Structures are given as C-alpha cells and as structure tokens.
Design a protein around this ligand. Structure first.
Ligand SMILES: Nc1ncnc2c1ncn2[C@@H]1O[C@H](COP(=O)(O)O)[C@@H](O)[C@H]1O
Ligand SMILES: Nc1ncnc2c1ncn2[C@@H]1O[C@H](COP(=O)(O)O)[C@@H](O)[C@H]1O
Ligand SMILES: [Mg+2]
Ligand SMILES: [Mg+2]
Ligand SMILES: [Mg+2]
Ligand SMILES: [Mg+2]
Ligand SMILES: [Mg+2]
Ligand SMILES: [Mg+2]
Lengths: 182, 182
C-alpha cells in the first residue's frame, strides 16, 4: 500500500555503503527522484554500565563531522545476526568488554528521510573489561570510563552530540534509577 | 589536525542530495574509502506547543522506511538562513503555524558515521495555526494536534520511532514542566 510507486531503482553505490537513487511516481501523480540508503539494515547501540555505577564509553573519530564524539559502543548488525548478538559483539570489539543482562530499549530510525536503518539500543548490566579491544581498519576510537552521574550531567548540559548516544541515555535513565545505579 | 588525510574526494551525486566518496590515508597509514553526505549542512526541528498544553505534530511518509512516522515539524536550513528562521519557516510550511518564543535545545548529529548534518532542536511556545500548510512536492504529511500528556506517554512507551523527534521531546520535557505546560 505504498503511497509512492517505483518507476526505476538505480544502485549508485554497492560498497562500502549501498546507496540507491529511485525515480518514483508520487501522491501528486508527478515524478520525483529519491536518494537513500536502502533496507533492511540495522545497528545496535549499548550503554555498558559496571557494578560500580560507571559507564564504559568510547571517544570516536567520526569523519563526516571531523570530530571525536563521546558515544556508547555500537555497530552494524551483520547478516543473520540478532540485535542483541551485535550489541554484545560490538561491545567486545570496541571496549573489550562483556556484560550480563542486556535490557532492550526502544528502537529508532536515526534519519528516516535518508536511510532505512533501524538502531536498536540496549542497557547492559555488570559490564566489565575482559580483553583488549579488536578494532577494524576504519575505527579510530579510545574507550573510557565515566561515573554515571558525570555522563548524565553531560547529557543535561547538552554536551552529548551523538543523537543515538543521547537517546539511549534518556531511555536508559529510568531503568538505571530503578536498579539503583543512578 | 585531522587524523585522516585526503587522497581524493569524488562527488558521487550532486542532487537531490550531495554525496561523496573519499579515498583517505588513515591513522594506520593504510588507505580507506569513506562515503558520506558532506557538510556544512543542517536542519531545524521544532516542538510547537500551544497555550492549551497540546503539541502540533505531523504524521509524515518517510520513503526509506516505507512508514508514516509521527514527528515534530522540521526541515533543512537553507543557504544563509539561521536555524531559528528555518524552524519558523518549516513550522509555517508544514503545519501552517506561527509561534512566539523559540527556546533552543541541544543540537545533535543524527548519524555522524554517514552525514555531517547537524540538527537544531527548538521548543516553540504559543504555537497557533494561522494559515493552510504549503508542502513541497516530495512532502506527504498531515498535521495533527495531541495533548502533551499523550505525546509523552507515547515517548515513554517507546512508540516514537523518529530519533530526532524523540530526542527533541526529551530535551523539551524539563522546560515544559518548568513553564507549567506539562
Ligand atoms: N559511511 C561509511 N563509509 C565507509 N566506511 C564506513 C562508513 N560507515 C561505517 N564505516 C566503517 O565500518 C566500520 C565498523 O563500524 P561499526 O559496525 O559501526 O562499529 C568502521 O571501521 C567504519 O570505518
Ligand atoms: N534523501 C532525499 N532524496 C530526495 N528528496 C529528499 C530527500 N530528503 C529530503 N528530500 C525532500 O526535501 C523536501 C522538504 O524537506 P524538509 O526541508 O526536510 O522539510 C521533501 O519534499 C523531500 O522529499
Ligand atoms: Mg561502532
Ligand atoms: Mg561492526
Ligand atoms: Mg565497531
Ligand atoms: Mg520536514
Ligand atoms: Mg524544507
Ligand atoms: Mg518541510
């Protein structure tokens, strides 16, 4: 029941990111070219909290912005992998950590006007570093540990620029207070 | 002081969205191809609240997701336009509304791994419909009015799928409580 009809779907790029340019007939009966990153595609985000009430985060270079941003560990869900498995895998790769319970938080689309990607946030409890990180070529980041009170102060001060990290923190807050970690 | 050095920047598309494919030399001294939507580019998001404690939102088709999403009015900042002016302009175009004070909320990057875009959220007070909407070809949406209590119930229930709308609501909440609108 799509309101727009496909006329022609052209692949503009296949790797490292698939991008398409689609000519469609809109609700006005006119034609329009829409450019986007097609689905199905997803990524998992995980706020790793330790038993000491601290969070394991990453300070990561994000080339398009030219900045190093404070973010929760996160990454693309591989083919046939569940969001929870991707969350645990990226946590291990980026911070060298493992966790016990992973509480699922509301999923969201970071930029639905351009990409079909769905981001799956999680709150990981009893997070602990157990091995050295294993980063891919392309990943420039350092892991760090911050008291939850400081992380939420930064959030309140509007200093968390990565939207997904900020949203994950907002969704995690009530759970953290309930669990007595915040 | 960029950690990555440009080898060659190729434009893959100029319109309707500019996209580039850049070959860079990374921190490992190796080469990598990075694909992204270059800056400077921005959009403004505005939560329009009425004097009756309701919010003016839009139910908008987002083609990449194939869904109609509940969002706050928002749009691209045009060349040489300020974020506040874009917020007021898109509010007028999409909902046919005007507002009095616009309180700036923390700006954020929706997906820094892929786009340089910065989103500028605002809380608009005394919002009121004054004219019919003026939508562009490409915009398929309907405006609606919901009590703030219902909007925040939806947020708490994890039903707000658009990340920017969800984050704008979280940042706006303390202000709304302070002002006595929530
Ligand atoms: N837009 C992009 N262009 C090229 N590589 C990307 C892009 N987005 C993410 N990557 C790469 O994918 C890798 C791992 O990402 P992640 O699964 O998100 O933790 C990194 O090394 C990135 O460089
Ligand atoms: N990725 C895209 N490809 C083609 N058109 C787009 C894309 N993203 C946004 N637009 C168009 O830009 C218009 C107004 O957007 P906005 O300023 O965001 O409210 C809409 O009519 C959209 O169809
Ligand atoms: Mg990652
Ligand atoms: Mg990965
Ligand atoms: Mg990774
Ligand atoms: Mg818009
Ligand atoms: Mg616009
Ligand atoms: Mg618009």
């Amino acid at each position: 029941m799509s309101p727009w009809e496909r006329i022609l779907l052209e692949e503009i790029l296949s790797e490292p990111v698939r991008l398409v340019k689609e000519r469609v007939r809109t609700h006005t009966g006119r034609e329009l070219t829409y450019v986007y990153r097609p689905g199905p595609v997803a990524a998992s985000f995980v706020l790793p909290v330790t038993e000491r009430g601290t969070a394991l985060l990453v300070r990561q270079y994000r080339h398009p912005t030219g900045k190093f941003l404070l973010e929760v560990p996160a990454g693309k869900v591989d083919e046939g992998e569940t969001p929870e498995a991707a969350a645990r895998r990226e946590l291990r790769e980026e911070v060298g950590a493992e966790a016990e319970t992973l509480i699922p938080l509301p999923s969201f689309h970071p930029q639905p006007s351009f990409t079909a990607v769905v981001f799956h946030p999680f709150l990981a409890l009893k997070a602990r570093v157990v091995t050295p990180p294993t980063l891919e070529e392309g990943e420039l980041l350092e892991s760090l540990e911050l008291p939850l009170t400081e992380v939420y102060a930064l959030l309140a001060k509007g200093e968390i620029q990565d939207a997904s990290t900020a949203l994950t923190l907002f969704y995690a807050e009530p759970h953290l207070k309930r669990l007595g970690l915040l």
